[PDB]
Symmetry: D2
Subunit: 461 residues, 4 copies
Amino acid sequence: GFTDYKVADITLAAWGRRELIIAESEMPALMGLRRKYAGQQPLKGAKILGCIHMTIQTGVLIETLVALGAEVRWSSCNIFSTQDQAAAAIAAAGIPVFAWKGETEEEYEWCIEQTILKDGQPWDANMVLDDGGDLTEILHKKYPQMLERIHGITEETTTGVHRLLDMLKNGTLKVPAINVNDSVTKSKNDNKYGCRHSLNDAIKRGTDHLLSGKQALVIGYGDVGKGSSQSLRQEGMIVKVAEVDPICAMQACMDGFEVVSPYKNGINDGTEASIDAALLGKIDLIVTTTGNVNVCDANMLKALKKRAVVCNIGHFDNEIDTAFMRKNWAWEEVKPQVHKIHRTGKDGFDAHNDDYLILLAEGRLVNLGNATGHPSRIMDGSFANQVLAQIHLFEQKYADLPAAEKAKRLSVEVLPKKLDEEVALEMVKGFGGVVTQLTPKQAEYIGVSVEGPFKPDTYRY
Amino acid sequence: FTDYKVADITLAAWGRRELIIAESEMPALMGLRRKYAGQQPLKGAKILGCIHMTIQTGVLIETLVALGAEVRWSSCNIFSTQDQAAAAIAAAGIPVFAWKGETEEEYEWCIEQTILKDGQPWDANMVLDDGGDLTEILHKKYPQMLERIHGITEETTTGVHRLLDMLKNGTLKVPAINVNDSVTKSKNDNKYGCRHSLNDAIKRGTDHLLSGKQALVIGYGDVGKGSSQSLRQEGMIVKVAEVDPICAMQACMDGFEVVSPYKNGINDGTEASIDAALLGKIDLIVTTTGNVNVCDANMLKALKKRAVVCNIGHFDNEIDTAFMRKNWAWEEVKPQVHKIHRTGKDGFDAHNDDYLILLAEGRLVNLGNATGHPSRIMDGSFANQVLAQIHLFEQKYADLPAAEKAKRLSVEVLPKKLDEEVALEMVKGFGGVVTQLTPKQAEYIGVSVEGPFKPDTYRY
Amino acid sequence: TPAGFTDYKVADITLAAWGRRELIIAESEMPALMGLRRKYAGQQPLKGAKILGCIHMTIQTGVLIETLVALGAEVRWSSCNIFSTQDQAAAAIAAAGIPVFAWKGETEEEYEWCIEQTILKDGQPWDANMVLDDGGDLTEILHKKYPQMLERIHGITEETTTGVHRLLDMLKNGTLKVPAINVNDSVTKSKNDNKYGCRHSLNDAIKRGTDHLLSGKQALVIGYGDVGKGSSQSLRQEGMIVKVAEVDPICAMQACMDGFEVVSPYKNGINDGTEASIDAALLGKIDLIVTTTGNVNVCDANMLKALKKRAVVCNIGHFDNEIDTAFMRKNWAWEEVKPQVHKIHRTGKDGFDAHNDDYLILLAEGRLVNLGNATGHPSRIMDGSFANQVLAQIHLFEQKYADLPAAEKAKRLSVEVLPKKLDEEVALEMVKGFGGVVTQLTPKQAEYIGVSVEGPFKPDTYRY
Amino acid sequence: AGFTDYKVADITLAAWGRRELIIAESEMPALMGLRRKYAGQQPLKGAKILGCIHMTIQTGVLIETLVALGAEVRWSSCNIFSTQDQAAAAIAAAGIPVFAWKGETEEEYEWCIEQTILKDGQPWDANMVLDDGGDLTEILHKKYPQMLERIHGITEETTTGVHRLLDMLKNGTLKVPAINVNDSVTKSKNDNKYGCRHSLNDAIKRGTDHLLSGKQALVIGYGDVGKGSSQSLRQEGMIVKVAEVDPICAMQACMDGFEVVSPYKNGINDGTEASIDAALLGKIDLIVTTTGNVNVCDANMLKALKKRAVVCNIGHFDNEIDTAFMRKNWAWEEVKPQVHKIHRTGKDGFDAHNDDYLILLAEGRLVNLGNATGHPSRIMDGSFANQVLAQIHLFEQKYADLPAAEKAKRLSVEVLPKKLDEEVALEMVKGFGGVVTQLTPKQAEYIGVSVEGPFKPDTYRY
Ligand SMILES: NC(=O)c1ccc[n+]([C@@H]2O[C@H](COP(=O)([O-])OP(=O)(O)OC[C@H]3O[C@@H](n4cnc5c(N)ncnc54)[C@H](O)[C@@H]3O)[C@@H](O)[C@H]2O)c1
Ligand SMILES: NC(=O)c1ccc[n+]([C@@H]2O[C@H](COP(=O)([O-])OP(=O)(O)OC[C@H]3O[C@@H](n4cnc5c(N)ncnc54)[C@H](O)[C@@H]3O)[C@@H](O)[C@H]2O)c1
Ligand SMILES: NC(=O)c1ccc[n+]([C@@H]2O[C@H](COP(=O)([O-])OP(=O)(O)OC[C@H]3O[C@@H](n4cnc5c(N)ncnc54)[C@H](O)[C@@H]3O)[C@@H](O)[C@H]2O)c1
Ligand SMILES: NC(=O)c1ccc[n+]([C@@H]2O[C@H](COP(=O)([O-])OP(=O)(O)OC[C@H]3O[C@@H](n4cnc5c(N)ncnc54)[C@H](O)[C@@H]3O)[C@@H](O)[C@H]2O)c1
Ligand SMILES: Nc1ncnc2[nH]cnc12
Ligand SMILES: Nc1ncnc2[nH]cnc12
Ligand SMILES: [K+]
Ligand SMILES: [K+]
Ligand SMILES: [K+]
Ligand SMILES: [K+]
């Protein structure tokens, strides 16, 4: 009689369970932690509020946390990213989860609140796992008394880490955090190669458009922009890259991309005259990857080639000025998470109008909105780090420290390099790769231990 | 002017033509000339320089001179000098001692010719080094000269490692800037430079088709990453070896099979430990580690007949060439290309099929069998070198009181803002256009519109 | 639209509005096909044509169907594969008043029944006079079961490699009854559809079926013809380590030069049928096998027994017998993951352990995986193939082979390709759809290389 | 000993050439397989072959295979810049008449061909021709018709030479049958495409040492050479645009991930400067011609090119670029052999620091052979195995000895049968260590082939 959940359709549970069993075989680092730590129960007594895309991969993460002793209450961090069979399988396992694909904004907020509250009162939470910072923000704004008893936050993604560091700067952050994003087996695995796999995946599922031979503009060339650019170039697109960071732009050039700006001489002064109309009128596909605001703005949207595809793979939908499009242009749903936006006006459209744009996932994270996000074998690395981060902060017991000791420990930190390497080793073994062992003479020659770590903390890979 | 030694001074006109072309390929370096020529920030500097005497190094040398410095120059490798570059620098009245094909003894003599002027120590006050050999000679043999020198600027990963070992041991005598770990150096030079120049050198040395053949790249740091791409883009089937599991993970994700020369990765010294089946299929082995003996005697014995063996790390001990000198007969095909006959030591059959082809006698193959990195890539590294020389020279460490020197003795990198400024000049050289953040956008992501755009922890 | 229309059978007519939305998008992706619509609509070159059509009932086929109709034809349609229909495409065609009998997930019995529903109208042979086929199944049924209908048919236009081979066999055996156009061997079909189509849709289908990471894993592609070339690229561009098998040494040479290792599932390439001839060390390392040959049993029972645990097995050739799925049905337990995705448990036939690790993943039950687990080739690629189909239909229909005297018929009973000039005109429209700009030869240049300024630009021997 | 019937740059380079020939033999298994297969049979005994093709190390292995099979030869190069002087020396030192050096003048080029045609001032008793580009074939038809009476055939290497043969056949002026070696798949789709993939960026790097990644290239043409050339540049990270007159080839460029553009506005070349897309050409760092056509990089294109762009040709003849215009109007500064800065500031003199120049490679001649070493041995293995088989077939047919009625039936331009194409391919695949699968009898029956091949109909395009 378990009822402490809300999912789209509980009858999808058997299907979700079949896919979880497959996913376990694709996630050796995460399942290795399950086997290594099961007897010890290092998360016994942990009570984790989790907010991250309710995918099959998150399902394996949740059940690893539970297998190590934790109790959890879970929600998704995006209205379109849940896989309903994954949510059903978790709910059918007796785990509180409030998540479905296609939530409204009000439902999204309600779902987070259902994890925070149990039977109408604050849950006895003591750990937080977040992706993007929404749950973290609600706790700080609305439930400060709950944070007094929370030992830490483990944050998944670049945007969430920025929000933690802003709180730390302002002296408003109430509990320490681990920046999971900046493990190399997260940032340079998930952010880059994950988007390489799943960006062209989502575009094909949403539009079935041929990509070879067409023109793309990727806004940004950080980890996500690098992987996105490769996702499209490997399909044969002619990819141009925009950047504000001259070092990242230099990498784009050296990687064989043309670096362009939507604005003449790169000056974004807000005028239509500043738009490089010739450039934008050639673009078949624009992808935003920045974690910034309004990097595909109204004047760019007005100048884009007819029938171009517009999508966002950064964490939040405000990378694209969709608000402008809702206010001025008529939306025609093609199918879920695929809309034609008719630039002919707001009040109705011609069904055969040629002047439209195709927007994917209403500008929300397109890989998760129009496909299934990153594949299991990539999320293996991110979620192995999440588990280790939860163990570390839970064992530190920040909430139980004296005030003076809390002040010495209130920080945003990364996991040590040795853990990062041990996660990587399990990933490599999953490919059947064979890592060479240094001889004593060789380890002495380059000044490392035979077991590692093999690089200084300054190394960038 | 007679204060130099080069292979042929009459090549000067040719080198000058190539320097004029190279200048048009090095916008960051030439931008430093234009912007600091008035200030003359290096007026009074006397720089000892030891780096591959290429055309690219000539543009660096003349940039330092254009900003006020005097220099005395040598190459940091016996095979890396471009004889027309050295001639052009000598013909410009700049002391330089470098030619392609030096002996080990001639290599040491050349460094000593920069250190000494008229049989006496030159009054040097700055050091520019690539690999640490000049730094090592100064500390061991001429330690008193180091009392006048304001700083060292080291170019490459191996040399930085040596600098840090000296700092840890309390034997570093002057402050130094790690030029290697600017992003516009490391992640431009070390990776992209080897992508351009590794397949270049293999083609010039052998003219072998690479497509469809099997390569083993030992290492997957920046040089191994660029080397692997240089071969894969030609259509090689590339396997990668690594001791670092993170770098190995990147190799897998980049589409490479990760293998070890040793069964289960365990290098226990025996022939039995060699994966003879793997090595018997490899047509090309490339070492990229900066480590010792990563292509060892037992691997060389197991290699497929007629395989190519080469090294693009800094030092020639990555391959056990000493074993091959002891046991096998060397047949020179042409300069820097040797057939190594595994049939025996004394003599060989001209038609023997059981040989390996060794490039550049195991020395840096890109500089040994071709011309190293291209000008537009070296532009990034060398603009950092100029900035680092200005920075250390203006701090005047050698003139500080004893107490102030103790706090000033360190190995530092350049600030990120300068790194970004070099990158911007490189991007403009491609005709790239960088976008400027709006004030609201800069506030949104927590940066200045000017930059730096990333925290110092960012890995790119 | 027509009142009381019931002459169809589809999965779900309510998908029609969704199908129509996608047809309108596809029209913008198919400029060669839509150019033929605009150029020929007024002439009505197919007025009076009654076309039996048998090809994958996708959105792309929908645009083809409505082009033929816009040029004057009546059609009756079925799919040429049990898994390749897009149900919203079939619904939109049926909702337009066009007889169509197709849905995703037909049984073999239903598949045959659907073709017969096109052949029959109101219980009697339709007065068909044209045939459009993909793989030869409809061609075969007409010759075998309804030979008298072939007396009124002017031509067959066959789409794919396997179907052309069947036509050539019939021609050499004297059993072909009507002339045909080999649409496959236009360059804008073969070297666009067969190669680039599979490049787009093979990794698409594997991702939709399994969501497996492909980068860093080991693939074996059996075959390196046009489909094998495109399939190998689909996987290599994702970062797979791809090995290629071939029986044709020229195709094997191309695979080597393209950067692939060429290997055989059998030691020294010799299949003596025994398990001892299997290269078990090779097969035990393969994460994904893809068959591309158009041949029989190229992924056989002994290979399936030797494959690495949890490897994915799929077929992108026309027929499922490339893989010995019959052996797997006889001996191993099938666990459906989701539609067109099965785990095949090598532990035995009767039961399976839900947590057994010794299984293979079979996609689309061995049927064309790009159409079975995704949506096949994209519209802009199918534009080339289907423009050729329209031109071929117009040519044969205007030829009126069925109305000729017996003597004249023997003279024209042939399998032909379209002339190179038309191939070039299709290609030009495709290039314009990318915004490409073709240069025009000067008179002096055209004289220098011996061509007309308007083309054709290559001799018929040219291979591109 | 006593051998003087040659002319090379420096005979003392022979030992060096020989060392490279021994290496190249291990890279050329199909050609060396033909040596072992036919050495005892001596199928070329009595053949006397006039040869005109790039005197490279790879051509050295071809020559010695023909000699090992019984033939005598007299050789020249088919390009003034393509000879490797150590290869020519090794051949001369083996007692084989060769007349070739890198850096010939036009007068020396013609003299070298004439030295092969004449021996002791009189027509050699030639009975076979091996040609690359058709220059030797043209001289024989125009100047030595009596020699063609006794010649059994021509085996022609390259696309341009084949077109010239077909023109002669059309006009009824071809005097002896030919084999089109170019259109074996192990030639055209190996040499023309993959060879240029290897050797184009090679020659550009040796000539300029320019970084290619991140820069803009324009490839004129997308046939076999243009496809290989575009890949040579793209795989280095260039942003490559492609021009074409053939819409099918342009379709392939699009689908291959290239932007297809024209140097002319709307692709209409009307001869005016107004027709030039100045904005497009002003952004191009490197232009490569691949067409076999005339004037596809014309004067107005050269005037509009971005300052300091590299200009080169990898088609067979230098007239793909209007170099004559540049010699008439602009000052040439030699950087080093086969690399010239062309100063667009005027014809008389230049400023050493002028920024407005172009870099021309190999004076517009075949850039891969002029600035590097052409295609690698393991690729040329395929082309030259086909050459040996073509020589054997036409020499054994003995066209010159046939009655007039029988000659009329055999006067044609043909390709080798596909079975032989496949046999060359298999030796190439074995050289990579590849393992071809053998069809079962049922599989061969199912697809309608013999187990041993041929595996494809003659219409198949690969
Ligand atoms: N969808 C996914 O699966 C996924 C995965 C990881 C991260 N993300 C999200 O994607 C975003 C980017 O993450 P990241 O790790 O790549 O961060 P990052 O800091 O490495 O890269 C962002 C880049 O955008 C550039 N940029 C910022 N404003 C710009 C502008 N106006 N124009 C052009 N370039 C601009 C920055 O210079 C920077 O290089 C974040 O919101 C992150 O949370 C999404
Ligand atoms: N030739 C050039 O132009 C050039 C340019 C830059 C640097 N270098 C030199 O190349 C070398 C590598 O430089 P880098 O920047 O790549 O350093 P790096 O630290 O980034 O890479 C070296 C890699 O080798 C790996 N490695 C070490 N021992 C190994 C072993 N036994 N087997 C397999 N892998 C092993 C390490 O794990 C590491 O990832 C240094 O000597 C550097 O000075 C050469
Ligand atoms: N799914 C699709 O979208 C699609 C598209 C076009 C064609 N096809 C089908 O794909 C198949 C292949 O078409 P194609 O145009 O590439 O034909 P093709 O003749 O060009 O190539 C088939 C290749 O398979 C090779 N082969 C045959 N038997 C083999 C064996 N035992 N082992 C290894 N290789 C073997 C042949 O040598 C040949 O090169 C046909 O059935 C065709 O109808 C499918
Ligand atoms: N350098 C080498 O090693 C090498 C090797 C093989 C062939 N070649 C030579 O290269 C040339 C091309 O050979 P191929 O086999 O690629 O021939 P091809 O017929 O396959 O290709 C030439 C292409 O040029 C295109 N073209 C013609 N005029 C054009 C124009 N004005 N603008 C743009 N494109 C135009 C044609 O449409 C055609 O596709 C010939 O001269 C051939 O002999 C050189
Ligand atoms: N599959 C996935 N599951 C959870 N978080 C993700 N972020 C990106 N892809 C994801
Ligand atoms: N989308 C598609 N429609 C019809 N036939 C196809 N063959 C391959 N892909 C196809
Ligand atoms: K997924
Ligand atoms: K260089
Ligand atoms: K489709
Ligand atoms: K060569």
